[PDB]
């Protein structure tokens, strides 16, 4: 039984009960409200008393088009209409501070099983309760849900109640009446009531008849938590997809498109510089030379929103965030799910489960056929599209006596699909097939976790079992067996995912994907816009993306610090991901002895430290975290450096 | 060798990092607070054209860059068959190209001299 | 490795060639000036096919020669390798480029003063 006393397994589902879970979830939404109340204070452009407000921060930019949509925030250029806005954000920040404090209190006592209220001098029961007095008695026949399946009806009801509350809040406090026309914010109140009716009706149908689907999920907390995470990740991916199409619709122009017209002063952006011999005095600058001379010394300079393209930068920062997470949660749902499939194969409950979500893949025969189809389709697609990108790169670089005429410029999405793209081009045919190939690639590591958590067609051949989920390897036997556990297969899903997770970043930043080299001053790189009649001028090619996008990163003293830090973090993953763990263990031994010897000779007292070294499974953990965190600490710079795609194409240089 | 490699990789890296911080005005620091005054001593000035901090750093980077890859070389010379750790763990390095001994002892990958050659090239 | 194994490779490549050749009509793309609509997909398909064929042959060839190299290849392998660079250098000055470049009249430029002055005129 492999050790589970690690600091990052303290809050595992094994160590918590259903009552503690509720307490844990509540103990965070209260913190989340405290966080949400800080993203509101920071967004005050001018204080209520008249003192100047806070400089633009990315944490408030991604929510500003929403607070403008709800009327809490305004885009007004006048201070009088910008002084009221500040008072409102204070109201909702203080309000979220109060409600957050209640949820933390109702999470601390929930976590400690201490459900006693002083005013009523009576302790409630978690096993059975009326639910908000008479309201629940009429709907749940005076009883509470006894299982996860029976919790669907009551849980659905709660959702209907929350929706109804949001609708009442928009009508009474925000003044948006429910008019059912889908070009105004007033339609978010109308559908807040339609959804509250669907869910309440759906929440009663599931209470009277609890669902029998996935009956085994009731038995284990991690089994249900993982199916929810495989579902929440897909939902989050869908939210990212929907927010990209919607945030740049004509109906969303008053909130997203309006950002272009404003002047933003982000912290860490270029500021008015000064001469080396600068001596600033209160009244005036003396014997000093200061740049611009329009602002005070060391004052952040303005930035034209239109040049920056802030409407698409903010759309990307939100769209990518709910996709970088959506795919992380799909990966974790399979991981924490296969983490539960290891236990049912170890204690042997697998062959007796009648669920077709476990019974369908019982036989190894089908497993190889299912994995052999994901593997064959990934090969026939990651090759068909890579050879197109490589061929397009060769044709435009005039390598091997070829020209941009012989390239895949005539290949584009079919007419049936053309509605999916504003401007159809080979850049769109490639992106669809890259995501298809990028999904089937990281799906291989996921089908492995689902099917080979304990035994594989090869290990059953080699007479071996995978006793744990976090075992690095079985030694150098059979030429080597490293990276065979499902935790390692999770790492190879996160690592392989970085490609499709980058085909999104590139494709939403208006870059070219149909060629490694687009827009460089070479033989046919600048002949794309006219060979294919592109209505837009994409910022750069896959490789030339790094050169162009970084002209704005190097100009910023903070975006460049991220570039440095992000690169420093990423290569350090090589130290713990290379097969040098044995070398590190020896080296440290020399360091402990060396330090002991130095202390001994140098000081009469002898002091030793016994330097520690991480384990492989503990190495592949810190390895993926340093590789993934480093790889997307810098993807932020591509999105936050500006959106530099243009609607004017380039004529051939000739 | 390890002590010299440490006291020199940390002395010169912190100079480069500090110069970078001073030049980008991070933490309200001007290039005036950087090591622009540090350059090779007068005795060595003949080695360089227009001596500067770019020359003081380069000498110490090569010194640190040699002592770093020298660690992987002193280990090939001294631990080809046995090391203080494997004499402790009661193990023999039978071979020059053996990958690891397996997961055992938190794992022991990259212990052969061929792998120590790789960590000298890398 | 006979009969249908090679037929599937050849037939598979051919049927694939029609797909793009048929996809081009479906795409209805505006072709590049002075270039036949039928010709553009055929040219694109041959280059893509050649790239995949080249990668496969290089991998199989290295595998076939990697384990077959013995003491007997002590002279032949080093001589054959000079026979790749040799035929390549000749090809570079015969097929890739004919002569050191000269102007339309036929004059040469080998000095910075000539480049500083020739560009002005």
């Amino acid at each position: 039984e492999t050790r589970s006393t690690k600091w990052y397994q303290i809050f595992d589902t094994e160590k918590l009960d259903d009552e503690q879970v509720v307490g844990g979830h509540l103990a965070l939404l209260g913190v989340l409200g405290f966080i949400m109340g800080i993203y509101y204070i920071s967004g005050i452009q001018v204080f209520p008393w008249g003192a100047p407000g806070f400089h633009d921060n990315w944490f408030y930019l991604t929510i500003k088009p929403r607070m403008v949509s709800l009327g809490i925030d305004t885009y007004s250029t006048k201070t009088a209409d910008l002084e009221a806005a500040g008072a409102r954000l204070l109201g909702w920040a203080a309000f979220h501070f109060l409600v957050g404090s209640v949820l933390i209190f109702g999470g601390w006592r929930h976590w400690t099983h201490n459900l006693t209220n002083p005013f009523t001098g009576r302790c409630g029961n978690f096993r059975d309760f009326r639910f908000l007095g008479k309201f629940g008695d009429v709907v749940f026949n005076g009883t509470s849900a006894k299982s996860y399946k029976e919790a669907l009806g009551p849980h659905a009801v709660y959702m209907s109640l929350l929706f109804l509350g949001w609708g009442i809040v928009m009508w009474a406090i925000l003044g948006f009446a429910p008019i059912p026309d889908f070009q105004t914010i007033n339609s978010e109140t109308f559908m807040s009531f339609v959804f509250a009716v669907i869910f309440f009706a759906l929440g009663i149908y599931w209470w009277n008849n609890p669902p029998n689907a996935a009956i085994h999920l009731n038995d284990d907390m991690k089994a249900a938590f993982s199916v929810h995470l495989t579902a929440i990740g897909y939902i989050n991916i869908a939210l990212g997809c929907i927010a990209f199409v919607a945030f740049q619709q004509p109906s969303f122009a008053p909130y997203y498109k309006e950002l272009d017209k404003l002047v933003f002063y982000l912290y860490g952006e270029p500021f008015n510089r000064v001469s080396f011999n600068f001596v600033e005095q209160g009244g005036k600058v003396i014997s000093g030379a200061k740049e611009f001379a329009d602002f005070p010394a060391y004052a952040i300079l303005p930035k034209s929103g239109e040049a920056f393209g802030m409407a698409r930068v903010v759309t990307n920062l939100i769209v990518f965030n709910h996709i970088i997470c959506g795919v992380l949660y799909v990966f974790a749902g399979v991981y924490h799910g296969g983490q539960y499939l290891l236990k049912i194969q170890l204690n042997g409950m697998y062959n007796q489960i009648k669920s077709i979500w476990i019974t369908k893949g019982r036989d190894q025969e089908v497993q190889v056929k299912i994995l052999g189809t994901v593997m064959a389709l990934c090969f026939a697609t990651m090759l068909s599209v890579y050879a197109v990108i490589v061929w397009n790169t060769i044709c435009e670089l005039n390598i091997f006596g070829t020209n941009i005429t012989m390239s895949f410029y005539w290949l584009k999405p079919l007419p049936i699909f053309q509605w999916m793209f504003a401007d159809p081009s080979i850049n769109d045919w490639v992106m669809a097939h890259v995501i298809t190939a990028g999904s089937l690639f990281s799906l291989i590591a996921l089908v492995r976790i689902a099917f080979f958590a304990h035994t594989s067609p090869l290990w059953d051949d080699l007479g071996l079992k995978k006793n744990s989920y976090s075992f690095p390897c079985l030694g150098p036997v059979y030429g080597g067996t490293c990276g065979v556990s499902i935790q390692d297969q999770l790492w190879f899903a996160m690592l392989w995912g970085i490609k499709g997770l980058s085909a999104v970043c590139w494709y939403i930043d208006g870059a070219w994907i149909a060629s490694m080299m687009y827009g460089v001053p070479a033989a046919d790189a600048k002949a794309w816009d006219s060979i294919a009649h592109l209505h837009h001028h994409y910022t750069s090619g896959i490789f030339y993306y790094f050169w162009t996008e970084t002209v704005t990163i190097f100009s910023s003293s903070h975006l460049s610090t991220i570039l440095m830090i992000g690169h420093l973090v990423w290569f350090i993953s090589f130290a713990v991901w290379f097969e040098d763990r044995g070398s590190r263990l020896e080296g440290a031994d020399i360091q402990t002895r060396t330090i002991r010897w130095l202390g001994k000779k140098f000081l009469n007292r002898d002091v030793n430290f016994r330097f520690p070294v991480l384990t492989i499974s503990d190495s592949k953990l810190a390895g993926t975290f340093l590789y993934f965190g480093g790889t997307f600490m810098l993807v932020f710079l591509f999105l936050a450096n500006g959106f530099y795609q243009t609607n004017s194409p380039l004529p051939p240089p000739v | 060798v390890m002590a010299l490699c440490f006291a020199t990789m940390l002395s010169v890296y912190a100079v480069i990092v500090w110069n970078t911080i001073c030049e980008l005005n991070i933490f309200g620091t001007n290039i005036t607070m950087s090591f622009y005054w540090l350059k090779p001593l007068p005795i060595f000035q003949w080695m360089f054209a227009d001596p500067s901090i770019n020359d003081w750093v380069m000498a110490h980077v090569i010194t640190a860059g040699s002592l770093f890859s020298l660690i992987a070389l002193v280990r090939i010379a001294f631990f080809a068959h046995t090391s203080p750790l494997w004499d402790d763990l009661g193990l023999k390095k039978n071979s020059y190209s053996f990958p690891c001994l397996g997961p055992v002892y938190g794992g022991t990958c990259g212990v052969s001299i061929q792998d120590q050659l790789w960590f000298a090239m890398l | 490795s006979n009969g249908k194994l090679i037929a599937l490779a050849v037939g598979g490549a051919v049927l694939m060639g029609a797909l793009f050749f048929s996809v081009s009509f479906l795409t209805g793309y505006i072709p590049a000036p002075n270039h036949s609509a039928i010709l553009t997909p055929l040219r694109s398909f041959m280059g893509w096919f050649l790239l995949i064929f080249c990668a496969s042959i290089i991998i199989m060839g290295l595998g076939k020669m990697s384990s077959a190299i013995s003491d007997k290849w002590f002279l032949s392998f080093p001589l054959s390798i000079f026979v790749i660079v040799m035929v390549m250098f000749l090809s570079l000055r015969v097929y890739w480029e004919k002569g050191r470049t000269t102007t339309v009249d036929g004059k040469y430029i080998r000095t910075t003063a000539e480049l500083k002055e020739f560009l002005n005129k």
Partner: peptide, 20 residues
């Protein structure tokens, strides 16, 4: 087919052998 399959992995092992 296990045996025949193992004769192969054994044909590519971490033990001493002749390499090109």
């Amino acid at each position: 087919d296990a045996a025949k399959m193992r004769r192969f992995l054994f044909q590519r092992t971490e033990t001493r052998s002749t390499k090109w």
